[PDB]
Amino acid sequence: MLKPNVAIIVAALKPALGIGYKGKMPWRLRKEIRYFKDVTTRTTKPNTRNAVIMGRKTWESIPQKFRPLPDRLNIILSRSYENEIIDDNIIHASSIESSLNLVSDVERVFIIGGAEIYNELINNSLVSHLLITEIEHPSPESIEMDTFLKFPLESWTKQPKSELQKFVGDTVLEDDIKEGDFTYNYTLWTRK
Ligand SMILES: NC(=O)C1=CN([C@@H]2O[C@H](COP(=O)(O)OP(=O)(O)OC[C@H]3O[C@@H](n4cnc5c(N)ncnc54)[C@H](OP(=O)(O)O)[C@@H]3O)[C@@H](O)[C@H]2O)C=CC1
Ligand SMILES: COCC(COC)n1ccc2c3c(N)nc(N)nc3ccc21
């Protein structure tokens, strides 16, 4: 695949854009996990599937029994990896672009974490779309967090919900979803 448009998908707590704590997610939002699965798995063309790219540490954080994530091509990046096809579902690579040379019959490509991957790849021109779940809490300061997004959002535009709906197709997008003390919304951003 030559120069595909890539999208980053992440869930972050406003206003600091915290994303983790001690190698884990600082929340358990059941509906958000379901959204993440639907958006990353659905395709429109026929014999296609999407690709999900993640850093080695995120891959290792998924219980062995539950990886690879089903119905998607999984790509794992490590600076110590040679570019190799493990099986039909797993690729090892040392750079996003080298990995893509090894794929065919992929519709969309998603970067799924973690922090180091996000913070570095946001500045790569292949990234054309950010799918950010904006999480709000009454006391964000009480949620322990150690890992944060460092995105230059002044160079990006938040689109109207209509544009997101067109992006996701069929997926149901509920507004102001509440789960315990958290309230969240799905958003789409594109470059200015
Ligand atoms: N809120 C959300 O939506 C999400 C949050 N997360 C959270 O992120 C945190 C985990 O993030 P983090 O620890 O930073 O780990 P990552 O998942 O980002 O893995 C980092 C590893 O990926 C490799 N790597 C990093 N950058 C590159 C690059 N540019 N090219 C090639 N390989 C690269 C290196 O592998 P090596 O060392 O082998 O060279 C590095 O050690 C946790 O808190 C986790 O829960 C994860 C996903 C989503
Ligand atoms: C398959 O699920 C694994 C978890 C954490 O890894 C251990 N997982 C990994 C990445 C994501 C994730 C994401 N990137 N974006 C949004 N919006 N929500 C998500 C929620 C669960 C996630």
Coordinates of C-alpha atoms and ligand atoms in Angstrom, one line a residue:
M1 CA 0.0 0.0 0.0
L2 CA 1.4 3.4 -1.1
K3 CA 0.8 6.5 1.1
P4 CA -2.5 5.6 2.6
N5 CA -4.4 8.2 4.7
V6 CA -4.0 7.1 8.3
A7 CA -6.3 8.0 11.2
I8 CA -5.3 8.2 14.9
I9 CA -8.1 6.9 17.3
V10 CA -7.8 7.7 21.1
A11 CA -9.9 8.4 24.2
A12 CA -8.7 11.3 26.4
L13 CA -9.8 13.2 29.5
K14 CA -10.2 16.9 29.2
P15 CA -8.7 19.4 29.6
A16 CA -5.1 18.0 30.0
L17 CA -5.7 15.1 27.5
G18 CA -4.6 12.4 29.9
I19 CA -4.7 8.9 28.4
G20 CA -3.2 6.5 31.0
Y21 CA -1.6 5.7 34.3
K22 CA 0.9 3.0 35.1
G23 CA 0.6 1.3 31.8
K24 CA -3.2 1.1 32.0
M25 CA -6.3 3.0 31.0
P26 CA -7.6 5.2 33.9
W27 CA -11.3 4.3 33.2
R28 CA -13.5 1.5 32.0
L29 CA -16.1 2.9 29.7
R30 CA -18.1 -0.1 28.2
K31 CA -19.8 1.8 25.4
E32 CA -16.5 3.5 24.3
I33 CA -14.8 0.1 24.0
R34 CA -17.7 -1.1 21.8
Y35 CA -17.4 2.1 19.6
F36 CA -13.6 1.5 19.2
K37 CA -14.4 -2.1 18.1
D38 CA -17.1 -1.1 15.6
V39 CA -15.1 1.8 14.0
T40 CA -11.9 -0.2 13.6
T41 CA -13.5 -3.3 12.2
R42 CA -16.2 -2.0 9.8
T43 CA -15.4 -1.8 6.0
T44 CA -17.4 -0.9 2.9
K45 CA -15.4 -2.5 0.0
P46 CA -15.8 -6.3 -0.2
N47 CA -12.9 -8.6 0.6
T48 CA -11.3 -6.0 2.7
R49 CA -10.3 -5.4 6.4
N50 CA -8.8 -2.6 8.3
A51 CA -5.3 -2.4 9.8
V52 CA -4.6 -1.4 13.4
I53 CA -1.1 -0.2 14.3
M54 CA 0.2 -0.1 17.9
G55 CA 3.5 0.1 19.9
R56 CA 5.0 -3.0 21.4
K57 CA 4.0 -2.0 25.0
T58 CA 0.3 -1.7 24.0
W59 CA 0.4 -5.1 22.3
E60 CA 1.9 -6.6 25.4
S61 CA -0.8 -5.1 27.6
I62 CA -3.6 -7.1 25.8
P63 CA -3.9 -10.5 27.5
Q64 CA -2.3 -13.1 25.2
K65 CA -5.5 -15.0 24.8
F66 CA -7.2 -11.9 23.4
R67 CA -4.6 -10.9 20.7
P68 CA -4.5 -10.5 17.9
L69 CA -7.6 -8.3 17.8
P70 CA -10.0 -10.2 15.6
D71 CA -11.1 -9.2 12.1
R72 CA -8.3 -6.7 11.7
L73 CA -4.7 -6.9 10.4
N74 CA -2.6 -6.1 13.5
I75 CA 0.8 -4.3 13.1
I76 CA 3.1 -4.0 16.0
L77 CA 6.0 -1.5 16.0
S78 CA 9.3 -2.0 17.8
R79 CA 12.7 -0.4 16.9
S80 CA 14.2 -3.9 17.3
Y81 CA 11.9 -5.6 14.8
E82 CA 12.8 -6.6 11.3
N83 CA 9.9 -6.2 8.8
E84 CA 8.2 -9.6 8.9
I85 CA 4.8 -11.1 8.2
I86 CA 4.1 -13.5 11.2
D87 CA 0.8 -14.9 9.9
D88 CA -2.2 -13.5 8.0
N89 CA -3.2 -11.3 11.0
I90 CA 0.1 -10.1 12.4
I91 CA 3.0 -8.1 11.0
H92 CA 6.1 -6.8 12.9
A93 CA 7.8 -3.6 11.7
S94 CA 10.1 -0.8 12.8
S95 CA 8.3 2.1 11.0
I96 CA 4.7 2.8 10.0
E97 CA 5.7 3.3 6.3
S98 CA 7.7 0.1 6.0
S99 CA 4.9 -1.9 7.5
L100 CA 2.4 -0.6 4.9
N101 CA 4.5 -1.9 2.1
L102 CA 3.8 -5.4 3.3
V103 CA 0.0 -5.0 3.2
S104 CA -2.7 -5.4 0.5
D105 CA -6.5 -5.5 0.6
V106 CA -6.7 -3.1 3.5
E107 CA -9.4 -0.4 3.5
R108 CA -8.5 1.9 6.4
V109 CA -5.5 2.2 8.7
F110 CA -5.8 3.2 12.4
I111 CA -3.1 4.1 14.9
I112 CA -4.4 2.7 18.2
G113 CA -1.8 3.7 20.8
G114 CA 0.1 4.0 23.0
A115 CA 1.4 7.4 24.1
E116 CA 4.9 7.2 22.5
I117 CA 3.4 6.1 19.2
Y118 CA 0.7 8.9 19.4
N119 CA 3.0 11.7 20.3
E120 CA 5.5 10.9 17.6
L121 CA 3.2 9.9 14.7
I122 CA 0.9 13.0 15.1
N123 CA 3.7 14.8 13.3
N124 CA 3.8 12.4 10.3
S125 CA 2.0 13.8 7.2
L126 CA 0.4 10.4 6.5
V127 CA -1.9 11.1 9.5
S128 CA -4.9 12.9 8.1
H129 CA -7.7 12.3 10.7
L130 CA -8.0 12.3 14.5
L131 CA -10.9 10.4 16.1
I132 CA -10.8 11.7 19.6
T133 CA -13.3 10.6 22.3
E134 CA -13.5 13.7 24.5
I135 CA -14.0 12.6 28.1
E136 CA -15.2 15.0 30.9
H137 CA -15.4 14.5 34.7
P138 CA -16.4 16.9 37.4
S139 CA -13.0 16.5 39.2
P140 CA -10.4 15.6 36.6
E141 CA -7.8 16.4 39.2
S142 CA -8.9 13.4 41.3
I143 CA -8.1 10.9 38.4
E144 CA -4.5 9.8 38.7
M145 CA -2.7 10.1 35.4
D146 CA 0.9 10.0 34.3
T147 CA 0.7 9.9 30.4
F148 CA -0.7 12.7 28.2
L149 CA -1.2 13.6 24.6
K150 CA 1.0 16.3 23.2
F151 CA -1.0 17.2 20.1
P152 CA -0.7 20.6 18.4
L153 CA -4.4 21.0 18.0
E154 CA -4.0 24.6 16.8
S155 CA -3.1 23.1 13.4
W156 CA -6.3 21.0 13.3
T157 CA -10.0 21.7 12.8
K158 CA -12.7 20.0 14.8
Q159 CA -15.4 19.0 12.3
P160 CA -19.2 19.1 12.8
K161 CA -20.9 15.8 13.9
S162 CA -22.2 15.4 10.3
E163 CA -18.6 14.8 9.1
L164 CA -18.0 12.2 11.8
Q165 CA -21.2 10.4 10.9
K166 CA -20.2 10.3 7.3
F167 CA -16.7 8.9 8.4
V168 CA -18.2 6.1 10.6
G169 CA -21.1 5.2 8.2
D170 CA -23.7 3.0 9.9
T171 CA -22.3 3.3 13.5
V172 CA -24.7 4.8 16.0
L173 CA -23.3 7.9 17.6
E174 CA -25.0 8.8 20.9
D175 CA -24.4 12.3 22.4
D176 CA -23.2 13.1 26.0
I177 CA -22.8 9.4 27.0
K178 CA -22.6 9.0 30.7
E179 CA -20.9 6.1 32.6
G180 CA -20.5 6.7 36.3
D181 CA -19.1 10.2 36.7
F182 CA -17.7 10.5 33.1
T183 CA -19.5 12.2 30.2
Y184 CA -18.1 11.7 26.7
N185 CA -18.6 12.6 23.1
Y186 CA -17.0 11.3 19.8
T187 CA -15.2 13.9 17.6
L188 CA -13.4 14.1 14.2
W189 CA -10.5 16.5 13.5
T190 CA -8.7 17.2 10.1
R191 CA -5.7 19.3 9.3
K192 CA -6.0 23.0 8.5
Ligands
LIG1 N1 -6.5 6.4 26.2 C1 -6.4 5.6 25.1 O1 -7.1 5.6 24.1 C2 -5.1 4.6 25.0 C3 -4.2 4.7 26.0 N2 -3.0 3.8 25.9 C4 -2.1 4.0 27.0 O2 -0.8 4.3 26.6 C5 0.1 3.9 27.7 C6 1.1 2.9 26.9 O3 1.9 3.8 26.1 P1 3.5 3.7 26.0 O4 4.0 3.1 27.2 O5 4.1 5.0 25.7 O6 3.6 2.5 24.9 P2 3.5 2.3 23.4 O7 2.3 1.4 23.2 O8 3.4 3.5 22.6 O9 4.8 1.4 23.0 C7 6.1 2.1 22.9 C8 7.0 1.2 22.2 O10 6.7 1.2 20.8 C9 7.9 1.3 20.0 N3 7.9 2.5 19.3 C10 7.6 3.7 19.8 N4 7.7 4.7 18.9 C11 8.2 4.0 17.8 C12 8.5 4.5 16.5 N5 8.4 5.8 16.2 N6 8.9 3.6 15.6 C13 9.0 2.2 16.0 N7 8.7 1.7 17.2 C14 8.3 2.7 18.0 C15 9.1 1.1 21.0 O11 9.3 -0.3 21.0 P3 10.7 -0.9 21.5 O12 10.9 -0.4 22.9 O13 10.4 -2.4 21.4 O14 11.6 -0.4 20.5 C16 8.5 1.7 22.3 O15 9.1 1.0 23.5 C17 -0.7 3.1 28.7 O16 -1.0 4.1 29.8 C18 -1.9 2.7 27.9 O17 -3.0 2.3 28.7 C19 -3.0 3.0 24.8 C20 -3.9 3.0 23.9 C21 -5.1 3.8 23.8
LIG2 C1 -8.6 -3.8 22.3 O1 -8.5 -3.1 23.5 C2 -7.3 -3.0 24.1 C3 -7.5 -1.6 24.9 C4 -6.2 -1.3 25.8 O2 -5.2 -2.2 25.3 C5 -4.8 -3.0 26.4 N1 -7.5 -0.6 23.8 C6 -6.4 -0.3 23.1 C7 -6.6 0.8 22.3 C8 -7.9 1.3 22.7 C9 -8.7 2.5 22.3 C10 -8.4 3.5 21.4 N2 -7.1 3.5 20.8 N3 -9.2 4.5 21.1 C11 -10.4 4.6 21.7 N4 -11.2 5.6 21.4 N5 -10.8 3.7 22.6 C12 -10.0 2.6 22.9 C13 -10.4 1.7 24.0 C14 -9.7 0.6 24.2 C15 -8.4 0.4 23.6

